[PDB]
RNA sequence: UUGACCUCAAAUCAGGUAGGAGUACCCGCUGAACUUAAGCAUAUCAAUAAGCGGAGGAAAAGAAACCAACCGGGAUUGCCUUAGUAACGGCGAGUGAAGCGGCAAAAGCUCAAAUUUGAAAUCUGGUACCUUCGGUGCCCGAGUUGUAAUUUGGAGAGGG
RNA sequence: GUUCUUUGUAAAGUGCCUUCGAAGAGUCGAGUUGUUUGGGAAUGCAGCUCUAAGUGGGUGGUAAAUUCCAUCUAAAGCUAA
RNA sequence: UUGACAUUGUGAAGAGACAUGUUUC
RNA sequence: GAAGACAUGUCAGGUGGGGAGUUU
């Protein structure tokens, strides 16, 4: 069908074709509010592929979301420590602009699950990301084996804890001996690591 | 009419001793975007409709295309709902025929015909020229000056 | 060397748990044993050799049987997982010698079980609580004790070193050749 | 000081070396006497040395004059010659 | 072939190497009818980025060792650039 | 002139959910200094103290774009071991795990990507009944900008 | 175990021939900066810039070019011990 | 405080360079 | 109405006891 026109198509995102409504979109989401919902998504070829199915209990949010480095919140950048610790204006905010967002739009949506969300326009002073949501009070999601496991309490505010696809990146949750540090916790694993056991027959 | 036809099917079937063929061949316009994609490229769909009101436009940018590619007439046509209610939806962006009856062939054949000479032979030249050169009232009336 | 120069007294975990955590597992392992009463209580596992020559020596059990494996035991991969047998998707089989090894070992499975009619009527059972102690691995005997004594005067010390420095020469052998 | 090694997994160097002395010591007690007494070709002893763990056969001691079939990785320029001259044959094994 | 030994070029046991089926994860990067359509399709109705165009011009006016050098510069992977130089001048020949 | 489609509003509309407390354990953000190097800024303290956000009896992770270079290993996690080693460090104070091996326990899998097109076959909600953690008949609505069945690479699919 | 139905004339599996095999994009990756790790000519994470192809891509603990080789298939997700 | 990178679109002439419509001031 | 591809996130150069650490 159209899957993979749109998808490609969205790959040459420096076409003239797609430069035009990159700058009517991002202009036409500036006149509007920093978090409004999307009555239909935009790119319905990367939500599908997301999880997303079009049917009740599925929302669709816009958000925008400033972008650059991050001003620690302390008075005239004193940090008041020694002075490799004065550094201010290069703290580079390790948590990536989509997480952000995607924890904006859950606390303006707590009543929903964040299930994913995706690029989908960027500004000089601002980002745009599309956030899929699911809710898990609907009785078709819950009637729903292929939905229902995220109404289970464990799995709320997933994006909060970085259970997401972009939060778990932000984590370095992944297999190999690259992801040592952070390939089943990096909290867990250093408390692990430095933890001195001692059984009941000394060894 | 669907619940009529079932039960229909349903006794011929179990007191009619029937094969489930009884009822005549359905002619129907297939709509559905991905299986309106789908039956092009096998050059089975007769004529193709497309809506110009789609705010999504990467959806239907590439059909144009698509079908000039393949030679199958395709048409654009105003307003995605005037669609939708020929088919009993909201909206559906996307109409094509598939299966006709042999009385109205010479009426589809003149429509593809005229359709043809409306946007097939204008695609070749219509890719080579930029639109929108349009200004407000004020300018227009300002710089004339 | 010793690294204190931390919080450690805030980390210290003394095991003193080990005899109530082995009393523990001893009654799950009852517990699921009678969850589990008609069932051996663990899965079937194949003959499988190590890695890193140090330990390749030494058989090893596997996590499952391979697909390949499976099909020749005679039955299908679904219906090995339901009949008490491990299979691994992931391990290929590219030894002869261990694929016929885990073929006998998965007819001998197959003809020492015994399956219930899913009809009910089922006799009693009599469990064991080990499928692996019923088919221990067993290591390949490498050679017999004794041989008939042959030689070639190859000296095969020398033929190491041949071997040892042919390997380093030969790129810069290919380069001078042309 | 010297040439640094990342990621020097010990499994490479993994060569325990065996003297001849404890080389007869590998066959049981059971047999050891008996194949001592009956030394000849026809049914020289099999000692399969990476079944026991040991790398490289190397010759510290000397050997009764028993040929013995000796299988090993590698093996010392002494070594192998001293069990040539015991009657035994230096056998390969990877 | 295994020589046997544990030195040399082929070291290792003697087995018979049974050969495996092929694994089809490997079949990821095989292309399709249809994926080779829609790209073809995409391609044409996109056209060629601005970096496409000025890759393909300096190919033209400069030779390809100056776009190669350029496109390493812009995708950072040389070994890509090669790709990319490749295709554009696929496109370029495409045009007579 | 009338009826539709899309967006956006109002509802003390009918049916729902969220705040907060607790916070020993977990998942992230943020985050110092004392001290140590007999001074001290790299560095150590520490990826800790404090602060912030998010749930449960466990949480996370989890079925490899992994480890190995082997006669191959085969979800994840934990213990012993590797190992106080590579390696890092005004190579100083000091920091420092992983592959193999033994054991603890074992479970698999499913979404997009196919035209069902001789049949949107899907589902929320309202109503009457009933054997009421729900089912049946009917009626609106969601849905073709894709709701049903099949397939997830181990494979898998159209045909004979 | 017992009792009320025959569930369905519906679903699933295996053998051979044949044509296919779609598998995730502001992502992978590169430059710079900040932080971090034992990670060392840059282990992981993040701001800015550039921005990719499908017999392709990742990894193979020393940077770079050339040519092979070994294993997986990221940018989607659930799961007790 | 200054330089560079995206926000930066669309328009003539002079300066040129290519191709058979593109790039620079 | 004025203005306009100029003003207006990331690096780099300059100034910076206005502020922080340390030495004497």
């Known amino acids: 069908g159209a899957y993979k026109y749109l998808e490609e198509l969205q ?5 003239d074709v797609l430069r035009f409504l990159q700058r009517v979109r991002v202009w036409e ?22 999880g997303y199915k079009a049917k009740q209990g599925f929302v669709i949010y816009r958000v ?45 949506a707590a009543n929903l699950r964040v299930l994913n969300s995706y690029w989908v326009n960027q500004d000089s002073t601002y980002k745009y990301f599309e956030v899929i949501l699911v809710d898990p009070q609907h009785k078709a999601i819950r009637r729903d084996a292929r939905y229902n496991w995220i109404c289970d309490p464990v799995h709320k505010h997933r994006e909060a804890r970085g259970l997401t696809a972009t939060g778990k990146k932000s984590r370095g949750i992944n297999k190999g001996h690259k992801f040592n540090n952070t390939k089943a916790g990096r909290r867990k694993t250093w408390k692990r690591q430095n933890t001195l056991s001692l059984w009941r027959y000394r060894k | 009419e669907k619940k009529e036809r079932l039960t229909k099917e349903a006794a011929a079937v179990a007191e009619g001793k029937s094969k489930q063929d009884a009822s005549p061949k359905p002619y129907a316009v297939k709509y559905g975007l991905n299986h309106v994609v789908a039956l092009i490229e096998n050059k089975k769909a007769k004529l193709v409709l497309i809506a110009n009101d789609v705010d999504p436009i990467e959806l239907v940018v590439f059909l144009p295309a698509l079908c000039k590619k393949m030679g199958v007439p395709y048409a654009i046509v105003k307003g995605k709902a005037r669609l939708g209610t020929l088919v009993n939806q909201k909206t559906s962006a996307v109409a094509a025929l598939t299966e006709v009856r042999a009385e109205d062939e010479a009426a589809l054949a003149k429509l593809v015909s005229t359709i ?12 080579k020229h930029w639109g929108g050169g349009i200004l407000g009232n004020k300018a227009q009336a300002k710089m004339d000056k | 060397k010793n690294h ?11 095991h003193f748990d080990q005899a109530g955590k082995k009393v523990s597992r001893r009654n799950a392992r009852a517990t699921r044993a009678a969850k589990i009463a008609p069932r051996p209580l ?18 090893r059990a596997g996590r499952g049987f391979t697909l390949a494996e499976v099909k020749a035991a005679g039955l299908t991969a679904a219906y090995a997982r ?19 090894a885990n ?37 390949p005997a490498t050679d017999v004790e004794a041989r008939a004594v042959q030689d070639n005067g190859e000296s095969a010390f020398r033929t190491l070193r041949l071997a040892r420095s042919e390997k380093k020469f030969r790129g810069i052998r290919e380069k001078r050749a042309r | 000081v010297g040439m640094r090694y990342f990621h020097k997994q010990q499994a490479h160097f993994w060569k325990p070396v065996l003297n001849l002395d404890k080389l007869w010591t590998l066959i049981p007690e059971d047999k050891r006497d008996q194949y001592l007494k009956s030394a000849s070709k026809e049914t020289a002893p099999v000692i399969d040395t990476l079944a026991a763990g040991y790398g490289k056969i190397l010759g510290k001691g000397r050997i009764p004059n028993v040929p013995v079939i000796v299988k090993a990785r590698f093996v010392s320029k002494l070594a192998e010659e001293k069990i040539r001259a015991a009657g035994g044959v230096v056998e390969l094994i990877a | 072939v295994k020589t046997g030994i544990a030195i040399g070029l082929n070291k290792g046991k003697k087995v018979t190497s049974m050969t495996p089926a092929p694994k089809i994860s490997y079949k990821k990067g095989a292309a399709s009818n249809r994926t080779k359509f829609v790209r073809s399709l995409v391609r044409e109705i996109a056209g060629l980025s601005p970096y496409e165009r000025r890759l393909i011009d300096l190919i033209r006016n400069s030779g390809e060792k100056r776009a190669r050098k350029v496109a390493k510069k812009r995708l950072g992977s040389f070994t890509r650039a090669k790709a990319k130089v490749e295709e554009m001048n696929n496109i370029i020949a495409a045009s007579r």
Request: glycine share 4%; hydrophobic share 30%; aromatic share 8%.
């Open chain 3, 82 to 100: 339901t009949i008490g047998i491990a299979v691994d998707h992931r391990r290929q089989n590219r030894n002869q010698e261990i694929f016929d």
């Open chain 1, 11 to 15: 790959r040459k995102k420096q076409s």
């Open chain 3, 4 to 14: 204190f120069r931390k919080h450690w007294q805030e980390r210290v975990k003394v």
């Open chain 3, 103 to 139: 073929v006998q070992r998965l007819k001998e499975y197959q003809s020492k079980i015994i399956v219930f009619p899913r009809n009910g009527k089922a006799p009693e059972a009599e469990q064991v609580l080990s499928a692996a102690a019923t088919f221990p691995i067993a290591q």
């Open chain 1, 64 to 108: 925008r979301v400033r972008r650059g480095n991050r001003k620690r919140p302390v008075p005239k950048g004193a940090t008041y420590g020694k002075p490799t610790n004065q550094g201010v204006n290069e703290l580079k905010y390790q948590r990536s602009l989509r997480a952000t967002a995607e924890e904006r739009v859950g606390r303006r």
């Open chain 2, 116 to 127: 043809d000479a409306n946007f097939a032979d204008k695609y070749d030249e219509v890719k």
């Open chain 1, 29 to 50: 989401y500036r006149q509007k509010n920093v978090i409004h919902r999307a009555a239909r998504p935009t790119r319905p070829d990367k939500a599908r592929r997301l």
């Open chain 3, 42 to 59: 663990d899965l079937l596992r194949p003959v499988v050799r190590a890695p890193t020559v140090k330990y390749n020596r030494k058989v």
